[PDB]
């Protein structure tokens, strides 16, 4: 049976990328993490303090507590049949803002702007995203030249 070590199997997970070793850039510490924002989790081997467990690597949760150079995240962890909201404490070197959450907050700012701009004009604009619809009918010009004839090539060695 395997060992239950905390960093067992994290040879490549917590390792630094190629030519990305050294000191941690400063902007990683300059990002503000308020309570309730969606942040990603990714362990960084350069800083061993406040390191997330190997199960939370690549996971995502919202911040509930904020301390000095460390935040608390409510991460979902499915064990057997019960997804569990885990309250973990990791430092800011192991977290990044989820761009998926920021892309949604921008859609709300535009939706609230479109429905407000449409009310002032009386028009009705759409806000619901629709999947890729079947391509509408269209004409395809040959340009005078005929289509290039293709055929299977013979077998060579």
């Amino acid at each position: 049976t395997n060992t239950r070590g905390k960093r067992r199997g994290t040879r490549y997970m917590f390792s630094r990328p190629f030519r990305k070793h050294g000191a941690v850039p400063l902007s990683t510490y300059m990002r503000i993490y308020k309570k309730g924002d969606i942040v990603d989790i990714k362990g960084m081997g350069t800083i061993q303090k406040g390191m997330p467990h190997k199960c939370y690597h690549g996971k995502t949760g919202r911040v509930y507590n904020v301390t000095q150079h460390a935040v608390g995240i409510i991460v979902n962890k499915q064990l057997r049949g019960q997804i569990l909201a885990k309250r973990i404490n990791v430092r800011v070197e192991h977290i990044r803002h989820s761009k998926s959450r920021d892309s949604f907050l921008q859609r709300v700012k535009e939706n609230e702007r479109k429905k407000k701009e449409a009310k002032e004009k009386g028009i009705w604009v759409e806000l619901k995203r629709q999947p890729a619809q079947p391509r509408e009918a269209h004409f395809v010009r040959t340009g005078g030249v005929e289509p290039q004839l293709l055929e299977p090539i013979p077998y060579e060695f």
Partner: protein, 49 residues
């Protein structure tokens, strides 16, 4: 398969030899792709409808 058995319920095809119409979009064709060995679909005309 559990993933195939879940898509066949979302199409209301819970038994053999039943049919439901599907509004074709990218979110629907990929569902029809996950259950191709279990379904036989196409494009019905007006007489079929």
């Amino acid at each position: 398969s559990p993933k195939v058995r879940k898509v066949l319920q979302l199409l209301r095809l819970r038994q053999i030899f039943n049919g439901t119409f599907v509004k074709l979009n990218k979110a629907s064709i990929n569902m029809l792709r996950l259950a191709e060995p279990y379904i036989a679909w196409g494009y019905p005309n007006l007489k079929s409808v």
